[PDB]
Structures are given as C-alpha cells and as structure tokens.
Symmetry: D2
Subunit: 27 residues, 4 copies
C-alpha cells in the first residue's frame, strides 16, 4: 500500500462526503 | 426513506472517516 | 500495521453504501 | 425534495472510498 496516496484520496472522500451531507441537511 | 435516519448514519460515517484519516496522518 | 484502520474504513464503506441504497430503495 | 445530485455525488464518494480500501490491502 501507499499511505500518502490514500491520505490524499481519503481527504477528498471526506471533503466530498461533507459537502453532500451538509447539502442534505439544508433541504 | 427517512432523511433523519440517513443523515444520522452519514454523520457517523463522516466522524469515523475523519478519525481514520487522522490515524493515518500520524503514521 | 494498519489492519485496524482498514477494518474501520470497511465499516465506514458498508454504512455509506447502506445509506446510499436506503435513500434510493426505501 | 429532489436529492438526485447528492445521490450521484455520494455514489462517486463511495467508488473512491471502495478503491482506497482495495489499494490499502494491496501488496
Ligand atoms: Zn497525492
Ligand atoms: Zn487504485
């Protein structure tokens, strides 16, 4: 595995998850 | 669906993702 | 080394998938 | 009301998370 590779991608997962989650909460 | 039930779970998804990401970042 | 983080992320993925399916099928 | 945009985006989030899981268990 490559830890720095997956940190960067999981950070994108987190940001995208949060964006859509917050969108769900304000409709 | 029940939007609150899914928001609750997705909140927990986000929290657990965040703590996994932090753990990875401190290696 | 990172089995515990893998295990945790697996449960994250399962719960995310279940929410996705529940939003479309319930 | 219409959550199609969040469903589409969370599907991509899930795909990226799933590939991270696969890649973390590689090698
Ligand atoms: Zn990178
Ligand atoms: Zn890959």
């Amino acid at each position: 595995y490559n830890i720095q590779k997956e940190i960067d991608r999981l950070n994108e997962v987190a940001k995208n998850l949060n964006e859509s989650l917050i969108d769900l909460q304000e409709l």
